[PDB]
């Protein structure tokens, strides 16, 4: 029984994030528990303040006509309990629910450990024989507590795109709003636990530039190459199959090279020291001790620049 | 209370993919959230536009008779909320729901990292005492947004087989339609993370063709063979037990060989260099340095051709 | 309101597997989505074909009395939507639902990678003041599509034990039926990925029978022993804690020995070659080169026979 | 509308375990699916057998007053469907539901691999203005099938403490019963997969008591110490953070020592063989070959005794 | 239909923890099952003890007006069954439910293995046209059994902040209470399983201060460094991405250093012993044997003090 109008009826929205959690980088989802605040004029139930009852009248959902506000990017039906409904005299309705649903917004792992994100929540609404435009009421959208969690993410700002996007979808127009959740990652625990350890093994790797024993140079460059897989694999696991290239996947891969040419040297410092030409060998080995850490720290300035600096 | 007809009543279908996600290579499933668009003439509730009400009359599901459209290949009951029902004058019904269910379509991992897929959604409908034929209405089947996600897959085309398949199933005929979702994989993250690293270790493996120390040749060929298991195991994990042979399972296995004959050589370059016949040894070792990388790159053109080229 | 009878009322059952999936070796469960087909004579609602309406009358569940058919070996309440109910003239009822529940049937991993299974679905029904006997109607039990999936398993046959098992359970007799799903595993991906790789490392292991360097023989036999744990652990993970012995757990363990005595040899080929008695040493080493691969392939014929051949 | 009585009304309980499963050592829970059997005299609905109807009258739950029997140690609300209600003439009610809930009973991992357990299910009931005492009816408590599963546990006995525990809880007395599920673990798969492999590596560890090469003794004692972590870590994972000491955590830890002093020896057999005093060295090494396996098998008799024998 | 009052109506709260469990360090949640005890004067249904019925009258929830008490920090809607409602003569209501919900309270891993925690449960209540103030009744808040579990945590005290926090939230004041659950961790299983094993490997690490073989010193210091990752990774897994530094993450990282300088020494004890200057080498090696374990145990007093002592 929709509110007989003279034009496209505006429904006024708003979301108060109460709880945020389980951001799942693999799945590219995250769970939210918030308030949903709808309101619209349904003159059809305006009500003579003095003549009867009081300032505002309380209805159960079954009584009033309520707009079907579906969330767009959600796994399942949003999971909402109704908090209160309050019809003002002029026929204005005040709806408030408290839903909790897991939201499917994409993430950009291009700078992985040092990435900032922008999550979305949507809200469409399909029309009947009066059109429905949704729009935001920013006093109910200051949604976000001073307790909004989201482990391992700094939360920057919950805003929303005031202007809705009105489509035609199957001979019935819908109206979609964009609620924006901006977050930066807490890179850090990525250092003592990934970056640093990763580097350390790389350095030991090429301690075999001050060594002559092939036996203890393969026992050296090869042992460390293994541990790098232990890190490549550790990192690769908590991260989805991007069709593009990650920052850490870059360096984690660039690293794979400095182990190949590392193993190339140790190898050549021998077919060239069993060829009785140690003239050359400890000339090369001697060089490597510079070329490598340089080319590296060089290729990291090259690489790091390539991602953040551009 | 089904619509009294003069022949098999046609129900007109359509699916607008809203969200796509969690394609699960192991489970051979994927989750979809879409619009379901049904429509049929139920002359039984045609309604004198002028004489009463308006252009089109809105019903709740309980009022009208609605056709039971079950999805065929689904784990559980499809999970739908109803968006709107609109009976036209002539007795034509306009049904629209917005379901979300996880769909069990098979995948062909024969070219694994470089595979294209064709997912299916089904929709049967069993008949009563008027026969039901389903068929597609292509304005509600343009289903698929410009936002359809499906991480790590390029989505090519959502179409549908116009001609339904009508069975006899238990003394009651059913009608099944075929909705087709064609996707190609985003192979790539498979290179810096699998293929390349995998190859690199293989090359280091046979750096022991320019070495004479058995000690550092086993510390060499054997250490790399381990890391290959680290990749065989990593790859074997995100991939089901195909009764056939994968492409990467091919080369990942072909590889296992170039480590066995590699370890064969290093081994023989010694029972033949402690047999005071280094005449032969460094004749073999010398050859291996070619035979191997050739036979390999040869067997990869042979293998690769065997899969893609045929 | 149960159908007043003159004897134990027979309810006629049937299950059409529509979808099969998520067989979970660890959990010993599997999920099924099928048709449930019940039927019984309730003369109490026979209905004068000519005198009124038509050939058959359609009821909602609330109207008719329907038998409580519970599935026995199920995690939770079976998850069924009703497809149609059709009372024939003589008072015969035609019930059809389409449930989906996850089923707890045990598996026998005794031949693990090469095992065939026999899954069960149950269906009890408890009685009131007329006894209920269930029994199968084999036209609704041809249940199983030509699309029944079950990844990594060949499906052999869906049948059912016609004769029900009628118990006394708490001063009320119940009647249970046995629906049988027979499957063989798709052993194979177990070869290029487990068996073969496992063997290869074992062979390299005992390449140290043609070597004299203890340094490169422990670097040899020990490195491979590690990789075998990487396989024991890989295999042990996707497999429950059987109180009995698995086939692959056999050979995977038999293998642990050929590494212990392998490491015994290399070890003794030294306290007996530093004891200036290489007379003996390269007599033993020389032998091992046969004893081992023989005793092995021997113990595998012994072992394999012990499991399959008996 | 509770049954007007002359004293504390006894409600008669009973539980028929139908299914048992998912015992979760980490979570200290387990799932059960059983019958709940309640019964009480509500003279208020006694009913003249001859005068009307029949022997016993069937009610829906809404009609009768039923006692709120909550399970105490449960994660969520118990998940029950009602099987039948049958009021006898004298006003006696026969209630039967078939719930399934996951139960939070603690476990004692003190003897871990060789531990027996005693699970609990509770059932309280709070009173109104007639007191409620619960008590057991042992014909409906023989609950437990001949099919009760519980993977990896031998089920010994389902009994119940006849005398209830009646508290005062918030100015209203409750009555709690204790249903006892006694199980022993199927230790075994813990031997070929943990205990044995664990020991084997320990033995190889100290094969370096018959060796003199420090290079191949560290390559020896150290490589095995790693693999022990692979087992410490494997075992530690499927086991919660006990504030006390596990048996296997004992020996798994005692083991850590025999690798420290093992590495101590190999180390000292060298700063004492490069000190040109091999007089002593191969005197120690010689001793270790006994002290170790003895002190070990000794400390295991000491340790094992300490846990089981006391 | 809220209770017509003369001022802000006080609702009297209380929570009897019945069950506690699944504290999830990664998720920063925990599950609780307790009694919720509300009470308020609704003079509107006072009732002439003598004139009618009895001492107290029992209502179903639908009859009375009940206050909407939502829990604040909860994932989903709290999951409550109602235990009893009892209106006293004066119009006093006695409400009692038994909810079970999972609670999102944050934890401070700053002292990780040796940390004490303070969990929160909240309870807001929004007002209508009489204000609602909640407040605690400490006879229904002694909530907590003598059976409160919470595996791997010692439970210290369940109390509550008597003075509520009254906000203005969207032109309607709410009232929030703070229920406090204080727990200390059962550090311990962290020693035989983490701390000790971790240390042991560190000690073996630097057994290469009494060794001269580079081959057996890298096979030494490097093998142990790996095992440390096996522990860093084991520990890092059951612990969230703190933006701050953990205690064990400190020492687990401080440790990474004593392996780098350890490997630095062994390395330098060689480019300085192949430089025919063993004068210096076995002067350094000799020193390390002290500097290390000291600087360590020193840096641990330094470190441990830095966390607990301040
Ligand atoms: As190694």
Instruction: Chain E: give the shortest CA distance to residue A211, in Å.
Output: 7
The answer to whether residue A4 neighbours chain B at the CB level (below 8 Å) is: no
Q: Which residues of A touch E104 (CB under 8 A)?
A: 19, 21, 149
Instruction: Nearest by CB to B54, from A28, A129, A260: name it.
Output: A129
Interface test mutation site (partner A, options B27, B146, B220, B285, max chain A beta carbons within 10 A): B220
What are the phi and psi torsion angles at E111 (to 5°)? -105, 25
Q: Which of E265, E252, E26 lies closest to A196 in space, CA to CA? A: E252
Handedness of CA C103, C108, C112, C113 (dihedral sign): negative
Distance D253 CA to ligand 1 centre (A): 24
Distance CA E15, CA B55 (A): 57
| A160 and A236 part of one domain | no
Task: Report DSSP state, residue C112.
Answer: G
CA–CA–CA angle B50, B56, B60 (5° rounding): 130
Handedness of CA A243, A249, A250, A254 (dihedral sign): negative
Lookup: tokens for E266: 């062994």
Distance A216 CA to ligand 1 centre (A): 11
Strand-strand pairing, E9-13 and E132-136: parallel
| C95 and C140 part of one domain | yes
Distance CA D47, CA A120 (A): 64
Q: Which helix (H) or strand (E) holds B217?
A: helix B215-237
Interface test mutation site (partner A, options B137, B207, B233, B248, max chain A beta carbons within 10 A): B207
Distance CA E152, CA A155 (A): 32
**In angstroms, what is the resolution?**
3.5
Residue E119 pairs with which residues in a beta bridge? E181
Q: Which of A204, C223, B219 lies closest to E267 in space, CA to CA? A: A204
Rounded to a whole number of angstroms, the distance between the first and last alpha carbons of chain A is 56
Q: Residue A223: closest CA among chain B residues belongs to which residue? A: B223
By the 8 A CB rule, do B72 and B78 touch?
no
What are the phi and psi torsion angles at E131 (to 5°)? -75, 145
| B7 and B129 part of one domain | yes
Distance CA B206, CA B223 (A): 11
What's the length of chain E? 310
Place of tokens 């959502």: B158
For residue C249, give the 3-state DSSP assignment: helix
CB contact under 8 A, A83 and E68: yes
Q: Which helix (H) or strand (E) holds C224?
A: helix C215-237
Distance CA E120, CA E182 (A): 9
| A202 and A260 part of one domain | yes
Lookup: tokens for B179: 């909705």
For residue B252, give the 3-state DSSP assignment: helix
The answer to whether residue A100 neighbours chain B at the CB level (below 8 Å) is: no
Burial of A123 (0-12, 13-18, 19+ CB in 10 A): buried
Distance CA A16, CA E126 (A): 15
Where among A157, A189, A221 does a domain terminate? Answer: A189
Distance CA D14, CA D36 (A): 6
Lookup: tokens for A212: 């002559």
CB contact under 8 A, A74 and B19: yes
Alpha-carbon B25 to chain mean position: 7
Q: Which of E130, E99, E126, E95 lies closest to E7 in space, CA to CA? A: E130
Distance C278 CA to ligand 1 centre (A): 28
Q: Which of B194, B177, B29 lies closest to B117 in space, CA to CA? A: B29
Distance CA E235, CA E113 (A): 10
List for chain E the helix, strand, coil content (%; round to 5): 35, 30, 35
Give me the CATH number covering residue E248: 1.20.58.390
Instruction: Nearest by CB to D215, from C215, C253, C256: name it.
Output: C215
By the 8 A CB rule, do A9 and A130 touch?
yes
Instruction: Chain B: give the shortest CA distance to residue C3, in Å.
Output: 25
Lookup: tokens for D236: 């530690």
For residue D130, give the 3-state DSSP assignment: coil
Task: Report DSSP state, residue D126.
Answer: B
| C109 and C202 part of one domain | no
Place of tokens 């936002």: B147
Q: Which of E127, E165, E138 lies closest to E8 in space, CA to CA? A: E127
Cβ atoms within 10 Å, residue E168 = 8
Distance CA E135, CA E39 (A): 10
Give the E-state strand segments of chain E in sequence order.
9-13, 15-24, 29-41, 57-58, 81-87, 92-98, 100-103, 116-121, 132-136, 153-168, 173-185
Task: Report DSSP state, residue D192.
Answer: I
| Ranges of H-type helices in C92-150 | none
CA–CA–CA angle E5, E8, E10 (5° rounding): 95
Instruction: Chain A: give the shortest CA distance to residue E45, in Å.
Output: 21
Lookup: tokens for D117: 């357990």
| C162 and C200 part of one domain | no
By the 8 A CB rule, do B95 and B42 touch?
no
Please give the C-alpha separations between residue E12 and each of B294, C190, C235, in angstroms, as whole numbers.
84, 64, 58
CB contact under 8 A, B151 and A232: no
Alpha-carbon D282 to chain mean position: 50
By the 8 A CB rule, do D118 and D60 touch?
no
Give the list of residues 6+ apart from residue E237 with CB closer than 8 angstroms, or none: none
Distance C223 CA to ligand 1 centre (A): 6
| E22 and E154 part of one domain | yes
CB contact under 8 A, A170 and B140: yes
CB contact under 8 A, B192 and A245: yes
Residues in A 17-76 with any Cβ partner in E closer than 8 A: 18-19, 21-22, 31, 33, 37, 54-56, 58
Q: Residue B227: closest CA among chain A residues belongs to which residue? A: A226
The answer to whether residue A106 neighbours chain B at the CB level (below 8 Å) is: yes
D partners (3+ CB pairs within 8 A) are C, E
DSSP, residue by residue, chain A: -----SS-EEEEE-EEEEEEEEEETTTTEEEEEEEEEEEEE-GGG---TTTSS-SSEE--TTTS-----B-SSBSSS---EEEEEEE-TTSEEEEEEE-EEEE-----GGGGGG-EEEEEE--B-B-SSS-EEEEE-TTS-----S----TTEEEEEEEEEEEEEEEE-SSSEEEEEEEEEEEEE-TTTTIIIIIHHHHHHHHHHGGGGS---SHHHHHHHHHHHHHHHHHHHHHHHTS---SS--HHHHHHHHHHHHTHHHHHHHHHTTTTTTSS-HHHHHHHHHHHHHHHHHHHHHHHHHHHIIIII-
Distance CA E140, CA E144 (A): 10
Distance A220 CA to ligand 1 centre (A): 9
Residue A49 pairs with which residues in a beta bridge? none
A156-164, long-range: CB within 8 Å, 24+ apart, which pairs?
A: A156/A116, A156/A182, A156/A183, A156/A184, A157/A182, A158/A15, A158/A17, A158/A182, A160/A15, A160/A136, A162/A135, A162/A136, A164/A133, A164/A134, A164/A135
By the 8 A CB rule, do B25 and B235 touch?
no
Give the E-state strand segments of B55-113 in sequence order.
57-58, 81-87, 92-103
Distance CA B53, CA B41 (A): 20
Strand-strand pairing, D173-185 and D29-41: unpaired
Q: Which residues of D touch C240 (CB under 8 A)?
A: 151-152
Distance CA E100, CA D79 (A): 13
Instruction: Chain B: give the shortest CA distance to residue A46, in Å.
Output: 23
* Residues in chain D preceding a C-to-N separation beyond 2.5 angstroms (breaks): none
Distance E281 CA to ligand 1 centre (A): 26
Q: Which helix (H) or strand (E) holds C82?
A: strand C81-87
The answer to whether residue D211 neighbours chain C at the CB level (below 8 Å) is: yes
Torsion on CA atoms D273, D277, D281, D286, rounded to nearest 10: 130
| A172 and A251 part of one domain | no
Distance CA C12, CA B214 (A): 75
Q: Which residues of B touch C35 (CB under 8 A)?
A: 170
Task: Report DSSP state, residue E272.
Answer: T
The answer to whether residue C124 neighbours chain D at the CB level (below 8 Å) is: no
Distance C264 CA to ligand 1 centre (A): 19
Rounded to a whole number of angstroms, the distance between the first and last alpha carbons of chain B is 56
Distance CA D152, CA C239 (A): 12
Task: Report DSSP state, residue E189.
Answer: T
CB contact under 8 A, E190 and D241: yes
Lookup: tokens for D30: 């387990």
Distance D235 CA to ligand 1 centre (A): 23
By the 8 A CB rule, do E97 and E80 touch?
yes
For residue B136, give the 3-state DSSP assignment: strand
Where among E189, E223, E256 does a domain terminate? Answer: E189
Label residues D269-292 b or e (16+ Cβ within 10 Å = b). Answer: bbbbbeeeeeeebeebbeebeeeb
Give me the CATH number covering residue A134: 2.70.170.10
The answer to whether residue E120 neighbours chain A at the CB level (below 8 Å) is: no
Give the orientation angle of helix B247-258 with respect to helix B278-304, to 10 degrees: 180
Burial of A50 (0-12, 13-18, 19+ CB in 10 A): exposed
Instruction: Chain A: give the shortest CA distance to residue B145, in Å.
Output: 10
By the 8 A CB rule, do A150 and A23 touch?
yes
| A91 and A1 part of one domain | yes
CB contact under 8 A, C76 and D213: no
Alpha-carbon C163 to chain mean position: 24
- Pairs across B and C, CB distance < 8 A: 144
Instruction: Nearest by CB to C84, from B128, B226, B240: name it.
Output: B128
Q: How many domains does chain B have?
A: 2
By the 8 A CB rule, do A269 and A220 touch?
no
Alpha-carbon C188 to chain mean position: 17
The answer to whether residue A5 neighbours chain B at the CB level (below 8 Å) is: no
For residue C237, give the 3-state DSSP assignment: helix
Please give the C-alpha separations between residue D54 and each of C72, D49, E132, in angstroms, as whole numbers.
31, 6, 54
Instruction: Nearest by CB to B218, from C16, C147, C220: name it.
Output: C220
What are the phi and psi torsion angles at A161 (to 5°)? -75, 105
Residue B157 pairs with which residues in a beta bridge? B182
Distance CA D305, CA D293 (A): 18
Place of tokens 């491979």: C224
| E149 and E263 part of one domain | no
User: Residue C109's domain spans which residues?
Assistant: 1-189
Alpha-carbon A108 to chain mean position: 7
The radius of gyration computed from the CA coordinates of chain C, to the nearest angstrom, equals: 30
Distance CA A55, CA A44 (A): 17
| D14 and D154 part of one domain | yes
Q: Which residues of A touch E271 (CB under 8 A)?
A: 210-211
Distance CA B266, CA C213 (A): 13
Where among A166, A189, A212 does a domain terminate? Answer: A189
Method by which the model was determined: X-ray
Please give the C-alpha separations between residue A255 and each of A223, A310, B118, E154, in angstroms, as whole numbers.
14, 22, 37, 46
Q: Which residues of D touch E192 (CB under 8 A)?
A: 245, 249-250, 252-253
Residues in B 248-277 with any Cβ partner in A closer than 8 A: none
Please give the C-alpha separations between residue A93 and each of A9, A60, A130, B3, E96, in angstroms, as whole numbers.
13, 12, 17, 39, 33
Place of tokens 């531990």: D115
Three-state secondary structure string covering A54-109? CCCEECCCCCCCCCCCECCCECCCCCCEEEEEEECCCCEEEEEEECEEEECCCCCH
Instruction: Nearest by CB to D140, from C74, C170, C229: name it.
Output: C170
Label residues C189-202 b or e (16+ Cβ within 10 Å = b). Answer: bbbbbbbebbbbbb
Distance CA E220, CA D208 (A): 14
CB contact under 8 A, B169 and C226: no
Q: Which of E297, E263, E11 lies closest to E128 in space, CA to CA? A: E11
Instruction: Nearest by CB to D219, from C104, C129, C218: name it.
Output: C218
| C24 and C157 part of one domain | yes
Alpha-carbon D8 to chain mean position: 35
What are the phi and psi torsion angles at E16 (to 5°)? -100, 95
Lookup: tokens for B109: 């991992």
Distance CA D124, CA D11 (A): 11
């Amino acid at each position: 029984p929709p509110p007989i109008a003279d034009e496209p009826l505006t429904v006024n929205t708003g979301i108060y994030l109460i709880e945020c959690y389980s951001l799942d980088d693999k799945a590219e989802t995250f769970k939210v528990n918030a308030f949903l605040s709808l309101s619209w004029k349904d003159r059809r139930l305006a009500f003579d303040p003095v003549r009867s009852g009081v300032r505002v009248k309380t209805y159960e959902p079954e009584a009033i006509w309520i707009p079907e506000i579906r969330f767009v990017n959600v796994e399942n039906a949003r999971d909402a309990d109704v908090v209160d409904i309050s019809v003002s005299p002029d026929g204005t309705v005040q709806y408030l629910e408290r839903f909790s649903a897991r939201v499917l917004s994409p993430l950009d792992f291009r700078r992985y450990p040092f990435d900032s994100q922008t999550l979305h929540i949507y809200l469409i609404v399909r029309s009947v024989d009066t059109r429905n435009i949704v729009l935001a009421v920013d006093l109910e959208k200051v949604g976000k507590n001073d307790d909004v969690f989201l482990t391992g993410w700094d939360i920057e700002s919950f805003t929303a795109v005031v202007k809705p996007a009105n489509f035609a979808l199957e001979d019935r127009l819908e109206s979609k709003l964009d609620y924006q959740l901006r977050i930066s990652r807490q890179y850090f625990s990525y250092i003592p636990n990934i970056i640093l350890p990763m580097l350390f093994i790389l350095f030991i790797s090429w301690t075999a530039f001050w060594s002559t024993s092939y036996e203890a140079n393969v026992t050296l460059v090869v042992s460390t190459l293994i541990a790098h897989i232990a890190f490549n694999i550790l990192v690769e696991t908590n991260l989805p199959k991007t069709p593009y290239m990650t920052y850490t996947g870059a360096i984690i891969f660039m690293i794979y090279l400095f182990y190949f040419v590392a193993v190339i040297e140790v190898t050549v410092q021998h077919y060239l020291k069993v060829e009785s030409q140690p003239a050359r060998a400890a000339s090369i080995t001697r060089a490597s001790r510079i070329a490598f850490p340089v080319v590296f720290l060089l290729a990291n300035i090259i690489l790091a620049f390539l991602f953040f600096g551009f």
